[PDB]
Amino acid sequence: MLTYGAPFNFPRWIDEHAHLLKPPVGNRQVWQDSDFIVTVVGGPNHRTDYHDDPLEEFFYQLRGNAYLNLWVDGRRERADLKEGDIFLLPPHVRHSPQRPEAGSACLVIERQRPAGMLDGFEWYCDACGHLVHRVEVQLKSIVTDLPPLFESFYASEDKRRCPHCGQVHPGRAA
């Protein structure tokens, strides 16, 4: 049967979930227990962590504008997600999404990761660019598997300390 239910109007769904598409929640997954992880991400939200996804990520910036801070070819780059833009991110490209605008909405589509295929989350030194800390996770649920990871980095000067220049990373806000 239709495990994930009947078709429904997407703009209306987004409107009805507007209260979840802003802090502190910020995002909302559309269907549960599906292979395709379909999420709408709102704003505002700024962050310092970079994601290393072992699979591809599809973006369609439906409302408002956002941007991804990236590492490409060993250098810091920015991919703008202007309203109306689509984008396909290859596996393992490190990315830190920034969503400055309230009322923005981005469709993000990913795949469930098989057992053994791990996600990485990491931070880089603002002073010398060296990797400061990386955690790998078997990502089953973003809601329980991810916030403690971030929280543990912010709470530890050891985790935040650059091994190259010794600068302590700011933590939650750059």
**Cβ nearer to Fe ion, comparing 9 with 141:** 141
Residue 110 annotated as binding? yes
Q: Token pair for residue 135? A: 């955690």
Buried b (16+ CB within 10 A) or exposed e, 148-162: eebeebbeeeebbbb
Closest listed residue to residue 75, CA positions, set 97, 89, 94: 94
**Cβ nearer to Fe ion, comparing 21 with 96:** 96
- Under the binding rule (CB under 5 A), the answer on residue 128 touching Fe ion is yes
Under DSSP, the state recorded for 150 is H
Give how many residues touch Fe ion by CB under 5 A. 10
**Cβ nearer to Fe ion, comparing 50 with 64:** 50
Closest listed residue to residue 108, CA positions, set 124, 86, 93: 86
Out of 18, 20, 143, 165, point to the residue binding Fe ion (CB under 5 A).
165
Q: Which amino acid is at 81?
A: L
Q: Token pair for residue 148? A: 């403690």
- Under the binding rule (CB under 5 A), the answer on residue 118 touching Fe ion is no
d(CA 155, CA 54): 27
Residue 106 annotated as binding? no
Closest listed residue to residue 142, CA positions, set 53, 16, 45: 53
- Under the binding rule (CB under 5 A), the answer on residue 164 touching Fe ion is yes
In the shown chain, the binding pattern of residues 77 to 116 toward Fe ion, with x for contact by CB under 5 A and - for none, equals ----------------------------------------
CB of 55 to Fe ion, least distance (A): 10
Give contact residues for Fe ion (rule: CB under 5 A): 51, 53, 125, 127-128, 130, 162, 164-165, 167
